[PDB]
Symmetry: C3
Subunit: 314 residues, 3 copies
């Protein structure tokens, strides 16, 4: 199945800039070229051009609502189209608010999809529970059916239609959840494996349970939304909201290796790589290389190694 890379250089979902440079940094490291060495056919859609909405005043506490809503409507259209042609979409972020468009467009073609969200955060604050008003911490709230009508309609998002139920998403890596968010995930009965569960079970058991929960009853497309801050700051330091005690480099690759093995990956997001936030050049290189490795892992690259079929190396 073909792969289509879609750059989403957008940072309006955040208070500070820099994450819009993520796609460029990833390409600079040769992500596209490296992906072409895998078993998949790769196509680069390029980077989307986003139109900044003039006089985009705050909707209550929410910041840049129209700009964020517009960027996501455009991304959703692009993703829906690539999905329609039967190709796996790979969105390079960009802040996590872009998951609204990515998942929305994906669901237009595969409404029965499930979501595996790797992040130190739930990103499920609503316009009413958010303390910052930053849309990068509210993606999931705009996507969940059970949250529909629980907050006022935000300018620029009227095109959004809640596509997934609280039962179709699984969080992995949680360790920085706001009171309101914790109330929401507990009240909605959302399935999650915070770092506490990862420590208890081991990443091996976490993936077994994640798959039995989401796929045990029926096999459906998987949308993996990977926020780089899900891994410990020691591995991915160049990111907006680093939180200590995260997933290790090994655990991140294990997650992606297992997702690859399911043969169900249909959509992927590689978010929050902010090249301007490295304390040193090396911290940026470290973060970019990790994001690249995770992406290649999603598409076949295994740590035990790989070799071409019908080729007698000896």
């Amino acid at each position: 199945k073909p792969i289509e890379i879609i750059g989403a250089p957008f940072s309006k979902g955040q208070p500070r800039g820099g994450v819009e440079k993520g796609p460029a940094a990833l390409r600079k490291a040769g992500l596209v070229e490296k992906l072409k060495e895998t078993e998949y056919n790769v196509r680069d859609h390029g980077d989307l051009a986003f139109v900044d909405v003039p006089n985009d005043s705050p909707f209550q506490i929410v910041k840049n609502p129209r700009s964020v809503g517009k960027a996501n409507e455009q991304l959703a259209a692009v993703v829906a189209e690539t999905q329609k042609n039967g190709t796996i979409s790979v969105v390079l972020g960009g802040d996590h608010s872009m998951a609204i468009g990515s998942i929305s467009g994906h669901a237009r073609v595969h409404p029965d999809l499930c979501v595996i969200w790797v992040d130190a955060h739930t990103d499920i604050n609503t316009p009413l529970t958010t303390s910052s008003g930053n849309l990068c911490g509210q993606p999931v709230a705009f996507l969940l059916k059970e949250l529909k009508g629980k907050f006022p309609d935000v300018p620029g998002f009227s095109w959004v239609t809640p596509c997934i139920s609280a039962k179709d998403i699984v969080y992995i890596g949680l360790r920085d959840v706001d009171p309101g968010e914790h109330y929401i995930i507990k009240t909605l009965g959302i399935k999650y494996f915070s770092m506490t569960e990862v420590d208890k079970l081991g990443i091996g058991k976490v993936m077994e349970e994640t798959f039995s929960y989401l796929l045990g009853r029926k096999k459906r497309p998987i949308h993996l939304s990977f926020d780089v801050d899900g891994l410990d700051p020691v591995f991915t330091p160049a990111t907006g909201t680093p939180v200590v005690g995260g997933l290790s480099y090994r655990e991140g690759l294990y997650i992606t290796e297992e997702i690859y093995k399911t043969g169900l990956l249909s959509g992927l997001d590689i978010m929050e790589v902010n090249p301007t936030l490295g304390k040193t050049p090396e911290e940026v290189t470290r973060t970019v290389n990790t994001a690249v490795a995770l992406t290649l892992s999603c598409f076949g690259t295994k740590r035990e190694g790989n070799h071409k079929p019908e080729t007698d190396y000896l």
Copy 2:
């Protein structure tokens, strides 16, 4: 149940100074204020003032015996009193010799208590087996009933009465045990999970077994004596005796989260944070923040998040 913070700025149990500054460093980081945000009622007893015993000559190889014995007698009295009023005592060290007074005072009110000792060391050397004579490496020897009469009475400790049996203590994190200490824990049949057992079982299984061993037969108060060097030097570098290959930050919090969940925590010690031993200011900040996080974890703070009851955040 109320919480009472007791500072024990004492370093005579060690050859070098600096650890007496631990309580100050912990408070500076806002430990007290942060604890007040938990579900517990918090009271700060302040820092105990210790009277240095004049001409405190060495008892054989043992150093500062009278000063250490006197400081611990005072701490035991203070702890016994807070325990008597039904409050959970939290001792901020200070070197680990202060566990003598902390546990002794605790046992005066809850004689059926059990001890979970998180440390890279057993701290079970007796005045006869010690190679250094430092009392910070001998706490447990003064507390165990089975060791009573196995060493000469040390000046300043005649007030001490062995309160716990070798069967009421569980070590977690061991990786730097002297020959004599190893002989003692094996000969006394003390239950332990050295790093070898943690690697084999995983911290999840270690806590299950620790609880079944200490609480399976009967539920009793838990005294958690946490030496910061139990965690790997990468997490808590500013400490007197760092040892490579320790518990991770995640594992330390898992331990404390599980202890919180038992609902049996009755006494706590946060020891060996020495602010003068950081190779850089950041290593000190790293160590203090970790100690603070572990303390908050013992009192309810969970990585999956927390929220106030009877509060509709939506």
Copy 3:
């Protein structure tokens, strides 16, 4: 059973120099003296003197073939002799090409031996599959019976006779395997636990399975060939080919503790410690100390502690 330390200061198996200084660095850290504190009788054979073969032109792509082949023939002779006298050989590298001589000499006395290869690499490239021509990445190819006749006879190695079968070796730590190597290990059905398997199973289960696979049917001598780059660069940075996401310090010691417990260790290699590759003096000290700890672990040193028999420490 006696122990005999054999230094192999050789670096011709690699493109760059420096690893020949490994034995010196290890001794400088007091490896020999520390080993004498264990339960084993220790003898130091000293460092072998290798004769550089003049005009050692490349055999096709292979570099320094005659020099590498000659050094290994000499090492094999020395190892065979120590093995003959019933002593455990401990080879200090030196680049991993020296495993050819170490294992070859070992097999002359214990032809039924098995090999546990801890490395981030398989080092199984043949003179035809190698992209570099460096012999440090081809040791196993010269040792495997199934690879006999799969590549042209290399000058300087005519003395070598494939001694082990693909079924007598187990890899642990793999995470950087070339396409050709992956083709070879899959085609030959070699047993391995790449980092993916370690993440899935946990090091505890990995060792159980390694032993059931190699020893379940019959107990035989164990040859442990330990490449320091098997551990993550955070623990052993001063090495030629560091690869992120490796075994932890704890896991490395667990491996060695378990091998010690089998009572079957017959030959040991401590390879790839290159003192010239530390980014700082401390990174070198860190690498050397780790190699020393692993070696002592192989001979009895346990993290739970150790004490002398027939000695009443109390």
